[PDB]
Amino acid sequence: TNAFCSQFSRGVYAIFGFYDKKSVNTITSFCGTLHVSFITPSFPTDGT
Amino acid sequence: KQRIEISRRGNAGDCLANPAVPWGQGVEIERALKQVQVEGLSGNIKFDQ
């Protein structure tokens, strides 16, 4: 959450990264809320 | 009843702010919550570590 908000406050256009099944909900929720694009090699989330 | 100081010394500020140093006394509160053993609607209430 700290890292994501750092990248966001920095004002980057898109974010590439990795997520654990523990941290995935946080990432998807934040990217979904602030309308910031996230790109990942990690396992596909179950959902839309 | 333990007489331990309760009120925090100062405002912690932003939670996201890094590095974030947690207020020590919080630990005590955790302890104070865990050692509680009381009776209620759910039956006997007691906690582990």
Curated annotation (Swiss-Prot), chain A:
Detected in forebrain. Detected in dendrites of neuronal cells. Expressed in the pyramidal cell layers of CA1 and CA3 and in the granule cell layer of the dentate gyrus. Induction: Down-regulated in the pyramidal cell layer of CA1 in the hippocampus by global ischemia. It is found in: Cell membrane; Postsynaptic cell membrane; Postsynaptic density membrane. Homotetramer or heterotetramer of pore-forming glutamate receptor subunits. Tetramers may be formed by the dimerization of dimers. May interact with MPP4. Forms a ternary complex with GRIP1 and CSPG4. Interacts with ATAD1 in an ATP-dependent manner. ATAD1-catalyzed ATP hydrolysis disrupts binding to ATAD1 and to GRIP1 and leads to AMPAR complex disassembly. Interacts with GRIP2. Interacts with GRIP1. Interacts with NSF via its C-terminus. Interacts with CACNG2, PICK1 and GRIP2. Interacts with GRIA1 and SYNDIG1. Part of a complex containing GRIA2, NSF and NAPA and/or NAPB. The M4 transmembrane segment mediates tetramerization and is required for cell surface expression. Ionotropic glutamate receptor that functions as a ligand-gated cation channel, gated by L-glutamate and glutamatergic agonists such as alpha-amino-3-hydroxy-5-methyl-4-isoxazolepropionic acid (AMPA), quisqualic acid, and kainic acid. L-glutamate acts as an excitatory neurotransmitter at many synapses in the central nervous system and plays an important role in fast excitatory synaptic transmission. Belongs to the glutamate-gated ion channel (TC 1.A.10.1) family. GRIA2 subfamily. The postsynaptic actions of L-glutamate are mediated by a variety of receptors that are named according to their selective agonists. This receptor binds AMPA (quisqualate) > L-glutamate > kainate. This is Glutamate receptor 2. It comes from Rattus norvegicus.
